[PDB]
Write a protein that binds this DNA or RNA. Structure first.
Ligand SMILES: [Mg+2]
Length: 406
DNA sequence: GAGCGGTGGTTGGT
DNA sequence: ACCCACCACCGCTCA
């Protein structure tokens, strides 16, 4: 749930992660900070086949993509209140990313971190994050349109635009929507009441009123008999019809379920404060660590496996190295050859950069046993956001720019 | 989780 | 008695 929510709030803006990451880097002068709920992986990585551990392999490639986007991720795990959690946490550490355990539900924690300013957006499986206080919420990190290929885009929902759009649904309203019609995930919901009726009750204002009331029987019995009377007669015309068959359980509205949404179990103030000092971390990618991980987990063994790690990892490391920080510069970028504004990044300016993968990664395939091909000591080419390049290798970008103006 | 067509119930009107 | 539009719910499909 909430089932049919997108008919009411819109299915969302659809947008390149690159574009979000780079717009934010341009506006706020630092990389986008993203809370990712580790639940999004369950039905997404199971399609992967072949080789060893194809599910954690896809996680690996998504992490390399995050490096390329220059995004500081914090992956949030559910708390007590077939990819191992331990293996995921290890791979997260190796990549210099952050792992965080929610005390309860991860989506609630993700929204909380956003509210408290630890992250700028949440990436989650659905828009429940909005009932929990999220303002910018992303879902469905995946490829675009008829292209069954690389995952470049996400679906963005803005709690502010939704509240001021046709649905009227803000945090308060949705809350009512699922007390009244969330009879599968929650107790004492109204049988026969679905999204339409619940929604037009939210609009009438019943969700605002309910959220501003002590959890004070005298006033919660009042609200109920306004709502109940209004459903029966539609005197104010808040509905499209009368609803006399709609029978309301004695125990509705369950105030303990209201508690679960308005005051969800999240980290303590002390924990929020530790995250302010420690996130994002000052961590670099553990290269030797990842070499050992990929040997053990994917059987990327011996020289072929060393060369495979290098090819896959190097564009990522380049971007990451750029965002850290008469002047060398070349130790990252050998040259630039072209510029484009591609539909896949929603016209984010990119420069065609050259680099030496093995040099950049710092692994020598020769120290490992031998068993049109890819040579990691030849120059490789990658498109990299012009903005990132300007921060990281400014005089190379300048030199290319004059080259162009001639 | 989210989209889809069928279906069975409700409502308000023929 | 019955139609009709709307709706919530169900199982089924991609995950
Ligand atoms: Mg959810």
């Amino acid at each position: 749930g909430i089932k049919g929510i997108y008919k009411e709030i819109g299915s969302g803006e659809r947008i390149s992660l690159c574009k979000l990451a780079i717009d934010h880097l341009e506006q706020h002068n630092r990389p986008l900070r993203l809370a990712i709920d580790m639940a999004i992986w369950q039905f997404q990585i199971q399609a992967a086949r072949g080789g060893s551990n194809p599910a954690i392999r896809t996680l690996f490639y998504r992490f390399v993509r995050l490096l390329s986007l220059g995004i500081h991720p914090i992956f949030v795990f559910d708390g007590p209140n077939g990819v191992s959690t331990a293996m995921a946490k290890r791979l997260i550490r190796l990549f210099g990313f952050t792992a965080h355990d929610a005390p309860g539900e991860a989506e609630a924690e993700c929204a909380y971190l956003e509210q408290q300013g630890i992250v700028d957006a949440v990436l989650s499986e659905d828009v429940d994050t909005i009932m929990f206080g999220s303002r910018v919420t992303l879902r469905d990190w995946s490829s675009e349109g008829s292209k069954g290929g690389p995952p470049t885009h996400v679906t963005l929902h803005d709690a502010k635009k939704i509240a001021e759009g046709p649905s009227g649904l803000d945090r308060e309203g949705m809350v009512l929507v699922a007390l009244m019609s969330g009879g599968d995930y929650l107790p004492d919901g109204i049988p026969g009441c679905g999204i339409k009726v619940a929604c037009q009750a939210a609009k009438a204002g019943f969700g605002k009123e309910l959220c501003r009331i002590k959890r004070d029987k005298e006033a919660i019995t009042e609200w109920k008999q306004r709502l109940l009377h209004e459903l029966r007669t539609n005197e104010s015309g808040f509905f499209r019809t009368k609803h006399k068959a709609l029978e309301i359980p004695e125990n509705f509205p369950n105030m303990e379920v209201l508690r679960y949404y308005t005051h969800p179990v999240v980290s303590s103030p002390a924990t929020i404060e530790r995250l302010r000092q420690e996130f994002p971390p000052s961590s670099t990618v553990d290269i030797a660590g990842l070499r050992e991980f990929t040997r053990e987990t994917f059987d990327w063994t011996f020289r072929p496996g060393a060369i495979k790690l290098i090819k896959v990892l190097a564009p990522g490391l380049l971007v990451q190295r750029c965002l850290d920080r008469k002047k060398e510069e070349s130790t990252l970028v050998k040259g630039i050859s072209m510029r484009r504004e591609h539909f896949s990044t929603d016209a984010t300016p990119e420069l065609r950069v050259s680099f030496i993968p093995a040099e950049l990664v710092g692994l020598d395939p020769g120290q490992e046993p031998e068993v049109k091909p890819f040579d990691p000591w030849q120059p490789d080419l990658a498109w990299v956001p012009e903005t990132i390049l300007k921060l990281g290798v400014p005089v190379t970008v300048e030199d290319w720019e004059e080259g162009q103006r001639s």
